[PDB]
Coordinates of all heavy atoms in Angstrom, one line a residue:
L1 N 8.1 16.3 4.7 CA 6.8 16.9 4.9 C 5.7 15.9 4.6 O 5.7 15.3 3.6 CB 6.7 18.2 3.9 CG 5.3 18.9 4.1 CD1 5.3 19.7 5.4 CD2 5.1 19.8 2.9
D2 N 4.8 15.8 5.7 CA 3.7 14.9 5.7 C 4.1 13.5 5.3 O 3.4 12.7 4.7 CB 2.7 15.5 4.6 CG 1.3 15.0 5.0 OD1 1.0 14.7 6.1 OD2 0.4 15.1 4.1
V3 N 5.3 13.1 5.7 CA 5.8 11.7 5.3 C 4.9 10.6 5.8 O 4.8 9.6 5.1 CB 7.3 11.6 5.8 CG1 7.4 11.6 7.3 CG2 7.8 10.4 5.1
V4 N 4.3 10.8 7.0 CA 3.4 9.6 7.5 C 2.3 9.3 6.6 O 2.1 8.2 6.1 CB 3.0 10.0 9.0 CG1 1.9 9.0 9.4 CG2 4.2 9.9 10.0
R5 N 1.6 10.4 6.3 CA 0.4 10.2 5.5 C 0.8 9.8 4.0 O 0.2 9.0 3.4 CB -0.5 11.5 5.6 CG -1.8 11.3 4.9 CD -2.4 12.6 4.6 NE -1.7 13.4 3.7 CZ -1.5 13.1 2.3 NH1 -2.3 12.1 1.8 NH2 -0.7 13.7 1.6
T6 N 1.8 10.5 3.5 CA 2.2 10.3 2.2 C 2.8 8.9 2.0 O 2.5 8.2 0.9 CB 3.2 11.4 1.7 OG1 2.5 12.6 1.7 CG2 3.6 11.2 0.3
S7 N 3.5 8.4 2.9 CA 4.0 7.0 3.0 C 2.9 6.0 2.8 O 2.9 5.1 2.1 CB 5.0 6.7 4.0 OG 6.2 7.5 3.9
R8 N 1.8 6.3 3.6 CA 0.7 5.4 3.6 C 0.0 5.5 2.1 O -0.3 4.4 1.7 CB -0.4 5.8 4.6 CG 0.1 5.6 6.1 CD 0.1 4.3 6.5 NE -1.3 3.9 6.9 CZ -1.6 2.8 7.7 NH1 -0.8 2.1 8.3 NH2 -2.9 2.7 7.9
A9 N 0.1 6.6 1.6 CA -0.5 6.7 0.2 C 0.4 5.9 -0.8 O -0.1 5.3 -1.7 CB -0.7 8.2 -0.2
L10 N 1.7 6.1 -0.6 CA 2.6 5.4 -1.6 C 2.5 3.9 -1.4 O 2.7 3.1 -2.4 CB 4.1 5.8 -1.3 CG 4.5 7.1 -1.7 CD1 6.1 7.2 -1.4 CD2 4.3 7.3 -3.2
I11 N 2.3 3.3 -0.2 CA 2.2 1.9 -0.1 C 0.9 1.4 -0.5 O 0.8 0.2 -0.9 CB 2.6 1.5 1.3 CG1 1.6 2.0 2.5 CG2 4.0 1.9 1.7 CD1 2.1 1.4 3.8
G12 N -0.1 2.2 -0.3 CA -1.5 1.7 -0.7 C -2.2 1.2 0.6 O -1.6 0.9 1.6
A13 N -3.6 0.9 0.4 CA -4.4 0.3 1.4 C -3.8 -0.9 2.0 O -3.1 -1.7 1.3 CB -5.7 0.0 0.8
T14 N -4.0 -1.0 3.4 CA -3.5 -2.2 4.1 C -3.8 -3.5 3.4 O -3.1 -4.4 3.3 CB -4.0 -2.2 5.5 OG1 -3.5 -0.9 6.0 CG2 -3.5 -3.3 6.4
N15 N -5.1 -3.6 2.9 CA -5.6 -4.6 2.2 C -5.2 -4.4 0.7 O -5.8 -3.5 0.0 CB -7.0 -4.9 2.3 CG -7.5 -6.1 1.6 OD1 -6.9 -6.6 0.7 ND2 -8.5 -6.8 2.2
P16 N -4.3 -5.2 0.0 CA -3.9 -5.1 -1.4 C -5.1 -4.9 -2.3 O -4.9 -4.3 -3.3 CB -3.0 -6.1 -1.7 CG -2.4 -6.5 -0.4 CD -3.5 -6.3 0.6
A17 N -6.2 -5.6 -2.0 CA -7.4 -5.6 -2.9 C -7.8 -4.2 -3.0 O -8.5 -3.9 -4.1 CB -8.5 -6.4 -2.1
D18 N -7.6 -3.4 -2.1 CA -8.2 -2.0 -2.2 C -7.0 -1.0 -2.6 O -7.2 0.3 -2.7 CB -8.8 -1.5 -0.9 CG -9.9 -2.5 -0.5 OD1 -10.7 -2.7 -1.4 OD2 -10.0 -3.0 0.6
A19 N -5.8 -1.5 -3.0 CA -4.8 -0.6 -3.1 C -4.6 -0.4 -4.7 O -4.3 -1.5 -5.5 CB -3.4 -1.1 -2.6
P20 N -4.7 0.7 -5.3 CA -4.6 0.9 -6.8 C -3.3 0.6 -7.4 O -2.3 0.9 -6.7 CB -5.0 2.3 -7.1 CG -5.4 2.9 -5.7 CD -4.9 2.1 -4.6
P21 N -3.2 0.2 -8.6 CA -2.0 0.2 -9.3 C -1.2 1.5 -9.2 O -1.8 2.5 -9.2 CB -2.3 -0.2 -10.8 CG -3.7 -0.7 -10.6 CD -4.4 -0.2 -9.4
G22 N 0.1 1.5 -9.1 CA 0.9 2.6 -8.8 C 1.4 2.6 -7.4 O 2.5 3.2 -7.1
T23 N 0.7 2.1 -6.5 CA 1.1 1.9 -5.1 C 1.9 0.6 -4.9 O 1.8 -0.3 -5.8 CB -0.1 1.8 -4.1 OG1 -0.9 0.7 -4.3 CG2 -1.1 3.1 -4.3
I24 N 2.6 0.6 -3.9 CA 3.5 -0.6 -3.7 C 2.6 -1.9 -3.6 O 2.9 -2.9 -4.2 CB 4.4 -0.4 -2.5 CG1 5.4 0.7 -2.7 CG2 5.0 -1.7 -2.1 CD1 6.3 1.1 -1.6
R25 N 1.6 -1.9 -2.7 CA 0.8 -3.1 -2.6 C -0.1 -3.3 -3.9 O -0.3 -4.4 -4.1 CB 0.0 -3.0 -1.3 CG 0.7 -3.0 -0.1 CD -0.1 -2.8 1.1 NE 0.6 -2.8 2.3 CZ 0.4 -2.0 3.4 NH1 -0.5 -1.0 3.3 NH2 1.0 -2.2 4.5
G26 N -0.5 -2.2 -4.5 CA -1.3 -2.4 -5.7 C -0.6 -3.0 -6.9 O -1.0 -3.7 -7.8
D27 N 0.8 -2.8 -6.9 CA 1.7 -3.4 -8.0 C 2.2 -4.7 -7.5 O 2.4 -5.5 -8.5 CB 2.9 -2.4 -8.2 CG 2.5 -1.0 -8.9 OD1 1.3 -1.0 -9.5 OD2 3.3 -0.2 -8.8
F28 N 2.5 -5.0 -6.3 CA 3.3 -6.2 -5.9 C 2.6 -7.2 -5.0 O 3.1 -8.3 -4.9 CB 4.6 -5.7 -5.1 CG 5.4 -4.9 -6.0 CD1 5.7 -3.6 -5.8 CD2 6.2 -5.5 -7.0 CE1 6.5 -2.9 -6.6 CE2 7.1 -4.8 -7.9 CZ 7.2 -3.5 -7.7
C29 N 1.3 -7.0 -4.5 CA 0.7 -7.8 -3.5 C -0.7 -8.2 -3.8 O -1.4 -7.4 -4.4 CB 0.5 -7.2 -2.1 SG 2.1 -6.8 -1.5
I30 N -1.2 -9.3 -3.1 CA -2.4 -9.8 -3.4 C -3.3 -9.8 -2.0 O -4.5 -9.5 -2.1 CB -2.3 -11.2 -4.0 CG1 -1.8 -11.1 -5.4 CG2 -3.8 -11.9 -3.9 CD1 -1.4 -12.5 -5.9
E31 N -2.7 -10.2 -0.9 CA -3.5 -10.6 0.3 C -3.0 -9.8 1.4 O -1.8 -9.5 1.6 CB -3.3 -12.1 0.6 CG -4.3 -13.0 0.1 CD -4.4 -14.4 0.8 OE1 -3.5 -14.7 1.6 OE2 -5.3 -15.2 0.5
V32 N -4.0 -9.4 2.3 CA -3.8 -8.5 3.4 C -2.7 -9.1 4.4 O -2.0 -8.3 5.1 CB -5.1 -8.2 4.2 CG1 -5.7 -9.5 4.8 CG2 -4.8 -7.1 5.2
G33 N -2.6 -10.4 4.5 CA -1.6 -11.0 5.4 C -0.2 -11.2 4.7 O 0.8 -11.4 5.5
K34 N -0.1 -10.9 3.5 CA 1.2 -10.9 2.8 C 1.3 -9.6 2.0 O 1.3 -9.6 0.8 CB 1.3 -12.1 1.9 CG 1.6 -13.5 2.7 CD 2.8 -13.5 3.5 CE 3.2 -14.9 4.2 NZ 2.2 -15.9 4.1
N35 N 1.4 -8.5 2.8 CA 1.2 -7.1 2.2 C 2.6 -6.3 2.3 O 2.4 -5.1 2.2 CB 0.0 -6.4 2.8 CG 0.3 -6.1 4.3 OD1 1.1 -6.5 4.9 ND2 -0.6 -5.2 4.8
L36 N 3.7 -7.0 2.4 CA 5.0 -6.6 2.0 C 5.7 -5.6 3.0 O 6.9 -5.6 3.1 CB 4.9 -5.9 0.6 CG 6.1 -6.1 -0.3 CD1 6.2 -7.7 -0.6 CD2 6.0 -5.3 -1.6

């Protein structure tokens, strides 16, 4: 259910700078071009 949008939430903003801690990019990435 709602996996498209919820997956986007789990991964975080495309640019890790805007992805909060707790999201994949927020916890693991720094730059938009290396965003996992």
Side-chain angles (χ1 to χ4, degrees):
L1 183 70
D2 206 19
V3 66
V4 169
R5 187 195 69 68
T6 296
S7 294
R8 294 284 280 202
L10 283 185
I11 67 181
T14 299
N15 184 338
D18 300 319
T23 67
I24 289 173
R25 292 171 180 144
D27 289 341
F28 295 112
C29 295
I30 292 165
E31 266 198 351
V32 65
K34 291 297 190 348
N35 67 349
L36 221 63

